[PDB]
């Protein structure tokens, strides 16, 4: 029928996975909870210059706070977002564990790494540490900062068009926090420098 892509969203509890996916208002409105699987599936539609794409984002019911995910949570995933908290160094050090599982259960699908809560001034995990088929982005879910970036990169990879663009932002929940334009510019530069080093 439609070109749908299963996107599994994973990462340590409290990293802001749920807050992040909920930003897309229609996807929240039209989500579906399946308790047997422990997942809320959000249909996130984005509109590219070459038409619409639909990400079916699997958000956990918080069972990562209890233990590991069932393998069937990952099954048939076509892309993924690994999420950590830039104010919590442990969430970042657990990223390889998440990556480890994804590669095991899943095919060589594209994966995006997202460091969340960059609006919080006291940042522990910075660009330098992060940069040393995978990409990284700073995001702040509470301020919609860089919200579209992970989806654009995955869309480009999945469709095989590196010149793919989004012609319009989906309806987003209004920012509950200000992303300081000065910090954002600085972080964006810190990433420019870290990229030049890579």
């Amino acid at each position: 029928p439609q070109v749908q892509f299963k996107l599994v969203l994973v990462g340590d509890g409290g990293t802001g996975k749920t807050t992040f996916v909920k930003r897309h208002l229609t996807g929240e409105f039209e989500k579906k909870y399946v308790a047997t699987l422990g997942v809320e599936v959000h249909p996130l539609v984005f509109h590219t210059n070459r038409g619409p794409i639909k990400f079916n984002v699997w958000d956990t019911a918080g069972q990562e706070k209890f233990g590991g995910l069932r393998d069937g949570y990952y099954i048939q995933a076509q892309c993924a977002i690994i999420m950590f908290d830039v104010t919590s160094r442990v969430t970042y050090k657990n990223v390889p564990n998440w990556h480890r599982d994804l590669v095991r259960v899943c095919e060589n699908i594209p994966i995006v790494l997202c460091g969340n809560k960059v609006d919080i001034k006291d940042r522990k995990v910075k660009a330098k540490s992060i940069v040393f088929n995978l990409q990284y982005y700073d995001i702040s879910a509470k301020s919609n900062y860089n919200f579209e970036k992970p989806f654009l990169w995955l869309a480009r990879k999945l469709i095989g068009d590196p010149n793919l663009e989004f012609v319009a932002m989906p309806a987003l929940a209004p920012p509950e926090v200000v992303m300081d334009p000065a910090l954002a510019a600085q972080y964006e530069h810190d990433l420019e420098v870290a990229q030049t080093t890579a």
């Binding site: 047997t36 699987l37 422990g38 069972q63 706070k65 233990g67 069932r70 069937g72």
Partner: protein
């Protein structure tokens, strides 16, 4: 109601009361010989068990019992099984199971064996 059902029900009520309000105070029900398997991860001893349960990354949690069945064992223990639902923080409601083996030591019942799982599966 049989004695093992009365004792079992009291343990269950006391366990989840403690678990829902202060996990840190759950040591008293366990002993050094106690075995905990928590979502596959095994733990031995009162100290290691309390540490695990305390370290669980949620701020609040709430359990409701759907059913609890109690039996007496041949070695005069009480084996209990629980099925129910829980809610951690502001997350969705999930099903869960939990088993307890209670042993009477010094006229005081303690948990020697504990197993926990979320009622989650690979496919619907």
């Amino acid at each position: 109601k049989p004695i093992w059902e009365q004792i079992g029900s009291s343990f269950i009520q006391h366990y989840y009361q403690l678990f829902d309000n202060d996990r840190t105070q759950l040591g008293a029900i366990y002993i050094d010989a106690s075995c905990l398997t928590w979502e596959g991860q095994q733990f031995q001893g009162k100290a290691a068990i309390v540490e695990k349960l305390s370290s669980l990354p949620f701020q609040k949690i709430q359990h409701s019992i759907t059913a609890q069945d109690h039996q007496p064992t041949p070695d005069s223990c009480i084996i209990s099984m629980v099925v129910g639902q829980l809610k951690a923080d502001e997350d969705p409601i999930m099903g869960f199971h939990q088993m307890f083996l209670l042993k009477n030591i010094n006229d005081a019942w303690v948990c020697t064996n504990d197993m926990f799982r979320l009622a989650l599966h690979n496919f619907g």
